[PDB]
Amino acid sequence: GPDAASKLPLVTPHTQCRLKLLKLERIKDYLLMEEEFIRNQEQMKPLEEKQEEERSKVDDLRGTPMSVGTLEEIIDDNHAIVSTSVGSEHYVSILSFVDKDLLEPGCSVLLNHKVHAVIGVLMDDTDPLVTVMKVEKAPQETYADIGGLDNQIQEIKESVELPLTHPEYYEEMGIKPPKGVILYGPPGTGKTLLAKAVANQTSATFLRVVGSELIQKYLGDGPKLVRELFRVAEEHAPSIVFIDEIDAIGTKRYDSNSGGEREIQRTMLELLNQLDGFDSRGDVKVIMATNRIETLDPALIRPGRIDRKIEFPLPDEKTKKRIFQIHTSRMTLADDVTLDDLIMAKDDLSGADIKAICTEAGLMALRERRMKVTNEDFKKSKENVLYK
């Protein structure tokens, strides 16, 4: 609603231009007349104080044991039906003291404890679902840290980050930004790394959900979480929703699923609507990451739902060296290990294997209370990770 700050962010002069001065003095004159305008009338008309008298009378009209209940329906204004504490419905009378605006059908209502009526709305406790996927800040991974993938970082920048920092570009050519991005590649290529990189330099509520939690126990509590996921995203202003391992909504079978595949499909048919249905969309951008782009219904990937398909290949030899350097940056090597010699250990190392080598190297140096990794540590590190 209204914003307490930012009375007039007219910083267009951005200098000592006199235009800044004229507006400021305007309020000062209005303030002066208001001062004696309120106190003067507050003496010969000592009916309402507006500071202690106003609040006082309403409190008496309220009750000491204020009740809490659920508003069930909105009958004509000044009248509503509110569900009592346990199981009863009362045709209460709405009092004007309430804002009369936050009366959503089912949020909350405060009622007098004897003549039950509407006395006031109650803000709804942050539902546990919102807190579950409300990623605050990406801990450490920056955007120059990712390294390697270069032509693939421009697509994500140009779909989920540019339209929020420089909208003019998709503002003068009359082109709406590409709807979504789907990331696909072998197991371990930076798919999620780039996914959390965008969360770093972003100004929107990031939400993350893995494909495995989209499949639930009871029937119907399937394509109902999908509705909740996109209901939270809309309520939270600009937001990037990240679905990870989307290939778990029909690639993995779980006994907890009361309904079998037939139930999982209806989850997809609800996810299909939530990405492109005849409802309004607003500002919500979907990033889907998967390691098997060939095992999902070719309608979830239809242009319009997800537009830009980004392909993540196994690291190139030149990029392999960059991966080692970034991961080994904060490591006191023993000027005896050569990075180039370990670049060729197996025909194709994902890159997540590179970090595994550089992380097991340290654990192989801790065992000897040594703060310098030698070629022996890496040699045994390169065998304990990608061999067994």
Partner 1 sequence: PRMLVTFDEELRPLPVSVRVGQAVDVVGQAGKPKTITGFQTHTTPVLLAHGERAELATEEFLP
Partner 2 sequence: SDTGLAPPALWDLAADKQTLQSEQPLQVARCTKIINADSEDPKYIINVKQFAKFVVDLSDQVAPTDIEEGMRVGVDRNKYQIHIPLPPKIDPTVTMMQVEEKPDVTYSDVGGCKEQIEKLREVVETPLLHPERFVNLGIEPPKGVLLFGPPGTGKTLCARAVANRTDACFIRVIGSELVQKYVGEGARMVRELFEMARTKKACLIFFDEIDAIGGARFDDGAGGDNEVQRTMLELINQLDGFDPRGNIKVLMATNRPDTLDPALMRPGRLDRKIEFSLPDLEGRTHIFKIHARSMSVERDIRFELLARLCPNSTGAEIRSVCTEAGMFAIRARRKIATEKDFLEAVNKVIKSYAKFSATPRYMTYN
Partner 3 sequence: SRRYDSRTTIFSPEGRLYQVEYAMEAIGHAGTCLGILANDGVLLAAERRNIHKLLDEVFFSEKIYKLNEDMACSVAGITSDANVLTNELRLIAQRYLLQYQEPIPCEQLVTALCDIKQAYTQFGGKRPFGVSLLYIGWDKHYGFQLYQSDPSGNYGGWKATCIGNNSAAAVSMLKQDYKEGEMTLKSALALAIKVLNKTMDVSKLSAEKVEIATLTRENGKTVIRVLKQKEVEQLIKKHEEEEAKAE
Ligand X SMILES: Nc1ncnc2c1ncn2[C@@H]1O[C@H](COP(=O)(O)OP(=O)(O)OP(=O)(O)O)[C@@H](O)[C@H]1O
Q: Does 173 bind partner 1 (CB under 8 A)?
A: yes
CB of 195 to Mg ion, least distance (A): 7
181-184 vs 308-311, strand pairing mode: parallel
The total of other beta-carbon atoms located within 10 Å of residue 284's CB is 23
**Phi, psi angle pair for 288, to nearest 5°:** -110, 130
With a CB cutoff of 8 Å and minimum separation 6, the contacts of 192 are 244, 289
Strand, helix or coil at 384? Answer: helix
64 is in an annotated binding site: no
Which residue is listed with tokens 């840290």?
Answer: 145
Q: What x-and-dash track marks residues 264-303 binding partner 3 by CB under 8 A?
A: ------------------------------x---------
- Known binding residue 190? Answer is yes
**Angle separating helix axes 225-235 and 261-275, nearest 10 degrees:** 20
User: Is residue 22 a contact point for partner 1 (CB under 8 A)?
Assistant: no
185 marked as part of a ligand binding site: yes
65 is in an annotated binding site: no
To partner 3, the closest distance from the beta carbon of 267 in angstroms equals 24
Report the alpha-carbon distance of residue 342 to residue 349 in Å, rounded: 11
Q: Euclidean distance between the first and final Cα of the chain, in Å?
A: 58
Of 106 and 167, the one with the shorter C-beta distance to partner 1 is: 167
Measured distance CA(297)–CA(306) in Å, rounded: 13
Token representation of residue 167 = 């909208």
Q: Where are the alpha helices (DSSP H) in 211-309?
A: 225-235, 261-275
Interaction of residue 27 with partner 2, rule CB under 8 A: no
Shortest Cβ distance from residue 386 to partner 3 (Å)? Answer: 8
Among 67, 192, 265, 319, binds Mg ion (CB under 5 A): 192
> Which x/- pattern, by CB under 8 A, does the window 146-185 give for partner 2?
--------x---x---x------xx-xxxxx-x-------
Restricting to residues 277-316, name those near partner 2 by CB under 8 A.
277-280, 293, 298-299, 301-304, 307, 309
Question: Is 212 among the residues that bind Mg ion (CB under 5 A)?
Answer: no
* Binding piece for partner 3, criterion CB under 8 A, among 63-71, 73-81, 99-107, 380-388: 380-388
Decide if 310 contacts 292 (C-beta within 8 A): no
Give the binding-site size for partner 1 (rule: CB under 8 A).
12
Annotated binding site: 185-192
Residues engaged in binding partner 1 (CB under 8 A): 12-15, 17, 19, 167-168, 171-174
